[PDB]
Amino acid sequence: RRSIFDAVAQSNCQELESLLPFLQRSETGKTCLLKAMLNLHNGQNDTIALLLDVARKTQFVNASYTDSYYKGQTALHIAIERRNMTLVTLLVENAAANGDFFKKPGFYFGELPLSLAACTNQLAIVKFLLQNSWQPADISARDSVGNTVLHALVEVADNTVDNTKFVTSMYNEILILGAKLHPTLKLEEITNRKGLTPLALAASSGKIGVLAYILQREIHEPECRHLSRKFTEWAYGPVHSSLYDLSCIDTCEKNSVLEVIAYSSSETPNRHDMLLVEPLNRLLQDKWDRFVKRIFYFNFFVYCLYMIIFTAAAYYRPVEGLPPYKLKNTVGDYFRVTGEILSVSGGVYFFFRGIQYFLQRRPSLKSLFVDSYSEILFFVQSLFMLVSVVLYFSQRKEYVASMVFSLAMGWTNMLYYTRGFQQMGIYAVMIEKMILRDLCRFMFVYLVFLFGFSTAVVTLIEDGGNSYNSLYSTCLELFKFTIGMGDLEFTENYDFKAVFIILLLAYVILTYILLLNMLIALMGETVNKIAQESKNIWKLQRAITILDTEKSFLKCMRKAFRSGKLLQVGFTPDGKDDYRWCFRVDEVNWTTWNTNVGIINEDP
Amino acid sequence: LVEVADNTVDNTKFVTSMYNEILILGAKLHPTLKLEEITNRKGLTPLALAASSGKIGVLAYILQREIHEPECRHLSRKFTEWAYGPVHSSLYDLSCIDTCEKNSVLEVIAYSSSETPNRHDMLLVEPLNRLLQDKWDRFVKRIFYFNFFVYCLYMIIFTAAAYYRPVEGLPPYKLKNTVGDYFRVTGEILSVSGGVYFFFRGIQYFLQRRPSLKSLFVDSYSEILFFVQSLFMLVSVVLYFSQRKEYVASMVFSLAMGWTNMLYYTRGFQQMGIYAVMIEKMILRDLCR
Amino acid sequence: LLQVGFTPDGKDDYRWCFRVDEVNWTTWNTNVGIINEDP
Ligand SMILES: C=C(C)[C@]12C[C@@H](C)[C@@]34O[C@](Cc5ccccc5)(O[C@@H]1[C@@H]3C=C(COC(=O)Cc1ccc(O)c(OC)c1)C[C@]1(O)C(=O)C(C)=C[C@@H]41)O2
Ligand SMILES: C=C(C)[C@]12C[C@@H](C)[C@@]34O[C@](Cc5ccccc5)(O[C@@H]1[C@@H]3C=C(COC(=O)Cc1ccc(O)c(OC)c1)C[C@]1(O)C(=O)C(C)=C[C@@H]41)O2
């Protein structure tokens, strides 16, 4: 064994030739062929052919490494990786890499020779394997996870421009070849174990390039034209109207692309930019303009009424006695009690809606305050209302201490409804983001400074006065300096006036002049950085609003409000009458001058 | 060759190319001799000299250089452990980047007196940033957080003991059998011990580094502030045991400084470390004018 | 501590290395000198 391995590594067949007659007369698992293939330089491994001939003259071709790390690897995989067309053909003429190296430091390409060839830019080897006379590869085969070659191609994509160009081109080539070989089979419809298709997988994983390619792709070849999603309804001059498939973009049995993009947990790289693709933005705008805007405005109006009733009923709360408060025959009492009942009902409604959302989505802690700010705020207001009810019926007077907070939250939650308008939706987005990010840092630093100087000042004071020798009072008096209401001499119970005035001046210069102006500068810089990002965040928020409204209204009319019209785009390869729910859009282009064919309809 | 380099793009290309050529020829003629190991009178090697003088181009060339020629391959620092497809894992030498007998590159870059042109950008080279992040994640983060926690405890004890200072009489204040007096005296002892500790640490730093006056407030802001707080504490002690009531006039200042020194510990976090950096720089530059 | 090759006179060039991975689509595998046979 050692001598054979040494001869194979040395690329010398003299020792192997001498030992062959002797053999005839007489943890890893690597075979002689695998070792020869691995230890090959510039195709200098010549012992492979002799070893294969000897093995045939004496099952060895399929020998594979048995190690869990490299389980399943064979000579064909090594040849394919090495980019040896001749060696690959020779090995094929005369499996799945399940090893941990090839599972989801490692490289994932699927677990089939066809997938490995497809993911590596060896198109010729893909073609040869697909139409190899000795043995053709199975285009529809799936690995352990269930990914096909198309799933593997989607997984490989990393949004790099060259990588995107590759993955899209190879996807198109494999699609066309698969259609040519097996017209009946629908390759894209296949799903992996998780249940996602290549399009759904691309939308879920954030691969914007693959999604953009798939959504709007046209194959002009008459041989394979049904493998397209964007057609051309007609064209007269520089004007032409086209269609988009919208097959599983609007409503799909498993999961549509819109809801996969919108309901992503923000771990997806670029959810915000994934809705700018050609069909999706226009589809969302169509849904907004058609039937969602009126429902949104009605919801806003009803919330306004609820808040007005809540404010009126809380303003006129009974003040004399202890809760609960017995009813009175006066009409005012009846109206007040009606207001309280309506407020409590609204609180319960929001409580249940928040619980429903948190169960359905199961957000993680990190993304809880980054993707569900509005839901958290509404749920917290409902929680305050319910605590207020519990205290009120427990003969406690602290219920008001809860109620007011809820009431305050109520009004400040009206900003949620500013997402129906672009220019105010962006303003609310910036308010949210600044509150989340900047104020935490600013307040940590501010409180460090304030507490340090308040402790120093109250230590200096001796109260011997107005009992200013209190930490709370000194903290409040030093905080007043920040809001332009600070008295420089608010006490005289100190033995040393110079120390007191020096401390106050230092605090004023360090916080009022330095920290606050620095915060102004940082807010200005942040406004510039996120001028465009806020627009994308607002668009995502409105898209989620549209999806929620449509899902809620599905009960009233599940399929009545469907986007796009059913149209015939051509004939199927086997039958005819290729009917699909298309979404027409027009376009005008002076430069190119009408040079194309395939206009579905004769007359514009 | 290192001395000649002036960080110009053409100059850098020259100096690196000639360095490589001379290295290869020297290896061919005299394989046994290790040319780079030689040092000048000051004791620096070409790599250490490049790191010290701020020559970022020469440092970047030296740190990550591979000579594929089989004749002279050991004259390389960045290898290639393996490669399967578009994925490959490589290695870096780290010979005298982490620990060196004379002076490692990391400590030469970090402990430079800011006269070096571009200390700040010299840590972005391929091995150094990842090496520092590895050290942070592995064993330094926990010690930093423990130090922050202990400083928080010290500051809380100091604040509590200074808040309840005796007000009637003249120092020193005789002890009382009450438990509150025992706790207060324990707080004072702990505060004084912390002040002495920071005093000695500041003296140690200033002796080891010997900063110049110009760079004193540009490279050792935190050290100066901690030393000044310790100085205030010691002056407070001296006045307190001299039967003077002005010790409080010192103590409070120290106390104030104490809390505002917590910002030193915001460098364990990027987004607040940058904020503290800007506070420092603005205080130094803009407010004077 | 890892072995990176053989010294010009002796052998077993051992040094304290710091491994890092890299991924690159564009260039397509064209080099030699991989220290280890198997990834
Ligand atoms: C859950 C969180 C973060 C939060 C809950 C409450 C207590 C809140 O204080 C904060 C912390 C705070 C405290 C003081 C000033 C700023 C922030 O911020 C919000 C939270 C911050 C707001 C600011 O107003 C808004 O953000 C409205 C709003 C903006 C964007 C939205 O998409 C939105 O949809 C619901 C609502 C107002 C309060 O909710 C309010 O009215 C009360 C009494 C305190 C504010 O805690
Ligand atoms: C050595 C110097 C420059 C200094 C020492 C003290 C007296 C200081 O005033 C200054 C001058 C001054 C006075 C008033 C306003 C701004 C600046 O600035 C600092 C110095 C300025 C600060 C500002 O807070 C900080 O800078 C905290 C800090 C930031 C960055 C750090 O890396 C850091 O590490 C220790 C600490 C607070 C004081 O130290 C403080 O608490 C007291 C009572 C006065 C401030 O002199």
Numbering used by the authors:
A (entry chain D): 114 to 139, 152 to 183, 188 to 223, 229 to 238, 243 to 602, 624 to 763
B (entry chain A): 291 to 579
C (entry chain A): 725 to 763
Give the exact sentences the study uses for this entry:
To address this question, we chose to study transient receptor vanilloid member 1 (TRPV1), which is the receptor for vanilloids and noxious heat. TRPV1 is a homotetramer, where each protomer has an N-terminal cytosolic ankyrin repeat domain (ARD) and a transmembrane domain (TMD) of six transmembrane helices (S1-S6). The TMD is composed of a voltage sensor-like S1-S4 domain (VSLD), a pore domain (S5, the turret, the pore helix (PH), the selectivity filter (SF), the pore loop (PL), and S6), and the amphipathic TRP helix. Vanilloid binding at the S1-S4 domain allosterically acts upon the pore domain, driving pore opening.
Various strategies of 3D classification of the 4 °C dataset consistently resulted in three distinct classes with nearly equal particle distributions to overall excellent quality. For the three classes of RTx-TRPV1 at 4 °C, we assigned class I, class II, and class III according to the size of the pore opening (class I being the narrowest). Based on this criterion, the 4 °C class I represents a nonconducting, closed state whereas class III represents a conducting, open state. Comparing the RTx-bound closed state of TRPV1 (TRPV1C,RTx) with the published apo TRPV1 structure shows that RTx binding induces slight local changes near the vanilloid binding site of the S1-S4 domain (S3, S4b, the S4-S5 linker), but otherwise the conformation remains similar to the apo TRPV1 structure. Because the backbone carbonyl groups of G643 in the SF can coordinate dehydrated Na+, as evidenced by the cryo-EM density maps of the TRPV1C,RTx and the published apo TRPV1, the only residue that can potentially block ion permeation at the SF is M644. In the closed state T641 (PH) and Y584 (S5) interact with each other, but they do not interact with Y666 (S6) which is concomitant with the first S6 dilation. 1 Initially, RTx binds with no significant conformational changes.
